[PDB]
Design an enzyme around this catalytic site. Structure first.
Site, PDB file in Angstrom:
ATOM      1  N   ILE A  28       0.745  -1.236  -0.061  1.00 16.73           N
ATOM      2  CA  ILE A  28      -0.131   0.100   0.056  1.00 16.73           C
ATOM      3  C   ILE A  28       0.774   1.377   0.014  1.00 16.73           C
ATOM      4  CG2 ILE A  28      -1.929  -1.306   1.221  1.00 16.73           C
ATOM      5  CD1 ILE A  28      -1.237   0.373   3.647  1.00 16.73           C
ATOM      6  N   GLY A  29       2.341   1.162   0.478  1.00 15.58           N
ATOM      7  CA  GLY A  29       3.122   2.254   0.399  1.00 15.58           C
ATOM      8  C   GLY A  29       4.193   1.817   0.508  1.00 15.58           C
ATOM      9  N   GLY A  34       8.827   4.183   5.091  1.00 17.77           N
ATOM     10  CA  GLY A  34       9.473   2.782   5.257  1.00 17.77           C
ATOM     11  C   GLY A  34       8.676   1.906   3.977  1.00 17.77           C
ATOM     12  N   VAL A  35       8.214   0.710   4.452  1.00 18.52           N
ATOM     13  CA  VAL A  35       7.642  -0.217   3.382  1.00 18.52           C
ATOM     14  C   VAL A  35       6.358  -0.802   4.021  1.00 18.52           C
ATOM     15  CG1 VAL A  35       7.664  -2.032   1.852  1.00 18.52           C
ATOM     16  CG2 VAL A  35       9.712  -0.325   2.196  1.00 18.52           C
ATOM     17  N   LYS A  51       4.528  -2.850   8.512  1.00 12.82           N
ATOM     18  CA  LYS A  51       5.793  -2.037   8.307  1.00 12.82           C
ATOM     19  C   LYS A  51       6.910  -2.937   8.320  1.00 12.82           C
ATOM     20  CE  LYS A  51       8.668   1.701   9.420  1.00 12.82           C
ATOM     21  NZ  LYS A  51       8.860   3.010   9.892  1.00 12.82           N
ATOM     22  N   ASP A 143       6.251  15.326  14.085  1.00  9.94           N
ATOM     23  CA  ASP A 143       5.899  15.051  12.579  1.00  9.94           C
ATOM     24  C   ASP A 143       4.346  15.126  12.583  1.00  9.94           C
ATOM     25  OD1 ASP A 143       5.748  14.920  10.134  1.00  9.94           O
ATOM     26  OD2 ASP A 143       6.694  13.032   9.691  1.00  9.94           O
TER      27      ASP A 143
HETATM   28  C1  LIG Z   1      -1.906   8.520   0.112  1.00  7.46           C
HETATM   29  N1  LIG Z   1      -0.917   8.315   0.934  1.00  7.46           N
HETATM   30  C2  LIG Z   1       0.479   8.301   0.523  1.00  7.46           C
HETATM   31  C3  LIG Z   1      -1.036   8.278   2.641  1.00  7.46           C
HETATM   32  N2  LIG Z   1      -0.028   8.614   3.467  1.00  7.46           N
HETATM   33  C4  LIG Z   1      -0.113   8.558   4.748  1.00  7.46           C
HETATM   34  C5  LIG Z   1      -1.192   7.950   5.393  1.00  7.46           C
HETATM   35  C6  LIG Z   1      -2.246   7.805   4.635  1.00  7.46           C
HETATM   36  C7  LIG Z   1      -2.440   7.754   3.128  1.00  7.46           C
HETATM   37  C8  LIG Z   1      -3.606   7.341   2.365  1.00  7.46           C
HETATM   38  C9  LIG Z   1      -4.566   6.323   3.127  1.00  7.46           C
HETATM   39  C10 LIG Z   1      -4.367   5.033   2.529  1.00  7.46           C
HETATM   40  C11 LIG Z   1      -4.333   3.941   3.726  1.00  7.46           C
HETATM   41  N3  LIG Z   1      -3.215   3.722   4.381  1.00  7.46           N
HETATM   42  C12 LIG Z   1      -3.186   3.496   5.773  1.00  7.46           C
HETATM   43  C13 LIG Z   1      -1.894   3.395   6.635  1.00  7.46           C
HETATM   44  C14 LIG Z   1      -0.948   3.587   5.165  1.00  7.46           C
HETATM   45  C15 LIG Z   1       0.182   3.533   5.215  1.00  7.46           C
HETATM   46  C16 LIG Z   1       0.908   3.408   4.037  1.00  7.46           C
HETATM   47  C17 LIG Z   1       0.165   4.037   2.879  1.00  7.46           C
HETATM   48  C18 LIG Z   1      -1.157   3.860   2.863  1.00  7.46           C
HETATM   49  C19 LIG Z   1      -1.826   3.804   4.153  1.00  7.46           C
HETATM   50  C20 LIG Z   1      -1.614   3.158   8.071  1.00  7.46           C
HETATM   51  C21 LIG Z   1      -0.588   3.429   8.571  1.00  7.46           C
HETATM   52  C22 LIG Z   1      -0.948   2.939   9.789  1.00  7.46           C
HETATM   53  O1  LIG Z   1      -0.006   3.033  10.731  1.00  7.46           O
HETATM   54  N4  LIG Z   1      -1.992   2.302   9.733  1.00  7.46           N
HETATM   55  C23 LIG Z   1      -2.279   2.368   8.504  1.00  7.46           C
HETATM   56  O2  LIG Z   1      -3.549   1.801   8.307  1.00  7.46           O
HETATM   57  C24 LIG Z   1       0.903   4.564   8.185  1.00  7.46           C
HETATM   58  C25 LIG Z   1       0.829   5.646   7.710  1.00  7.46           C
HETATM   59  N5  LIG Z   1       1.902   6.060   7.732  1.00  7.46           N
HETATM   60  C26 LIG Z   1       2.727   5.169   8.104  1.00  7.46           C
HETATM   61  C27 LIG Z   1       4.209   5.139   8.450  1.00  7.46           C
HETATM   62  C28 LIG Z   1       4.779   3.894   9.035  1.00  7.46           C
HETATM   63  C29 LIG Z   1       3.709   2.771   9.350  1.00  7.46           C
HETATM   64  C30 LIG Z   1       2.405   2.897   9.236  1.00  7.46           C
HETATM   65  C31 LIG Z   1       2.023   4.068   8.674  1.00  7.46           C
HETATM   66  C32 LIG Z   1       2.474   7.303   7.147  1.00  7.46           C
HETATM   67  C33 LIG Z   1       2.195   7.566   5.572  1.00  7.46           C
HETATM   68  C34 LIG Z   1       1.198   8.803   5.572  1.00  7.46           C
END
Ligand SMILES: CN(C)c1nc2ccc1CCCCn1cc(c3ccccc31)C1=C(C(=O)NC1=O)c1cn(c3ccccc13)CCC2
EC number: 2.7.11.26
Length: 347
Positions: A28-29, A34-35, A51, A143
């Site tokens: 998803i990311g 990270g990953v 993660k 952050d």
């Molecule tokens: C578009 N987009 C790029 C985006 N970025 C972020 C947040 C949301 C979204 C879109 C929502 C799609 C669902 N979506 C939910 C995410 C997630 C993570 C990555 C991609 C999509 C995602 C979640 C987390 C988390 O903890 N539990 C989650 O469910 C985290 C968010 N982050 C981090 C980092 C390190 C560990 C876990 C997580 C930081 C990223 C900030």
């Protein structure tokens, strides 16, 4: 149905590994944070985020050890962790949530429409709450921004995430100053400040508040240097006394004097006065003049939330706003009077 099966250590409980199985492993990311994969728990059916990071075998982990002392319903819960590019990765199993505040704000904005104020009240309150619970440990997030605010649309429940940058602040130990995303970076950090407090989270949450009223970032700026220029336009030029409070390493300024643009004629006309009053208490040059999260929860701007006959636009009840622990009220117990209104005391 390609089920992975690992042995995984529970997040908050005692150190006792169980067997756990899951499937539907898609990414998803993949970025600075990270990953992350989405996945599905075989037993329950529930969803999760996982993660993955290369971990220096001969060392602790700062993110893992911060999350294991946390259990708050406005903070994304760590369920389990385990290990498994060649050698040794760390894995963290986390609660899944599909929407963010950033995404939702973005939708109203590009269609030329404002975010209804009720949603503004709900979201910040729950954030200030989430800040209060971590600040009672010394743990600073470093952050705060809309992309790190996860959100359930139908219920309105909101959950802070991404404790990759988080750190426990200790008196006397220096910390790096180039940190947080530019638009939400406090001026002390800009000035080079090295022994800043957790009130940098409070600045950042102010920048988020104003954003949700204007429908766009309040202090953009096109470089680390230009970020203080966009600030100065509003709050004017800081005094040597203010500059001392932020950093005792500046004596002479490097950019002409400007006067403060007033708060009323920054926003739109119909904006409520307590939103603006609050915002003035968050965005102050002097760190000690800024509110505490718990003091922010008690602001007159959030009084509508403490009404008993109050519901969301979709008719439903609001989530629980008044189930404060003692740990959560510990920094200022007297505030219980206001935070918990009469009808939420029912024995
Ligand atoms: C578009 N987009 C790029 C985006 N970025 C972020 C947040 C949301 C979204 C879109 C929502 C799609 C669902 N979506 C939910 C995410 C997630 C993570 C990555 C991609 C999509 C995602 C979640 C987390 C988390 O903890 N539990 C989650 O469910 C985290 C968010 N982050 C981090 C980092 C390190 C560990 C876990 C997580 C930081 C990223 C900030």
């Amino acid at each position: 149905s390609k089920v992975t099966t690992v042995v995984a250590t529970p997040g908050q409980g005692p150190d006792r590994p169980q067997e756990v199985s899951y499937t539907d492993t898609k990414v998803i990311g993949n970025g600075s944070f990270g990953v992350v994969y989405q996945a599905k728990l075989c037993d329950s059916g529930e969803l999760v985020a996982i993660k993955k990071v290369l971990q220096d075998k001969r060392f602790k982990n700062r993110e893992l050890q911060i999350m294991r002392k946390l259990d708050h319903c406005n903070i994304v819960r760590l369920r389990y962790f385990f290990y498994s590019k060649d050698e040794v990765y760390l894995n963290l199993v986390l609660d899944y949530v599909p929407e963010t505040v950033y995404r939702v704000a973005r939708h109203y904005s590009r269609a030329k429409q404002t975010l209804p104020v009720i949603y503004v009240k709900l979201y910040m309150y729950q954030l200030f709450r989430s800040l209060a619970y971590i600040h009672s440990f010394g743990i600073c997030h470093r952050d705060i921004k809309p992309q790190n605010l996860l959100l359930d649309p139908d219920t309105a429940v909101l959950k802070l995430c991404d404790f990759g940058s988080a750190k426990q602040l200790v008196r006397g130990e220096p910390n790096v100053s180039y940190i947080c995303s530019r638009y939400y970076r406090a001026p002390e950090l800009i000035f080079g400040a090295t022994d800043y407090t957790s009130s940098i989270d409070v600045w950042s949450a102010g920048c988020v508040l104003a954003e949700l009223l204007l429908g766009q970032p309040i202090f953009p700026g096109d470089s680390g240097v230009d970020q203080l220029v966009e600030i100065i336009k509003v709050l004017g030029t800081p005094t040597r006394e203010q500059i001392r409070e932020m950093n005792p390493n500046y004596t002479e300024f490097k950019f002409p004097q400007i006067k403060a643009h007033p708060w009323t004629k920054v926003f739109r006309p119909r904006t409520p006065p307590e939103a603006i009053a609050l915002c003035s208490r968050l965005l102050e040059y002097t760190p000690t003049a800024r509110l505490t999260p718990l003091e922010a929860c008690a602001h007159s701007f959030f009084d509508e939330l403490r009404d008993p006959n109050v519901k969301l636009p979709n008719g439903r009840d609001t989530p629980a706003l008044f189930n404060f622990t003692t740990q959560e009220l510990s920094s200022n117990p007297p505030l219980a009077t206001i935070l918990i209104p009469p009808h939420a005391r029912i024995q």
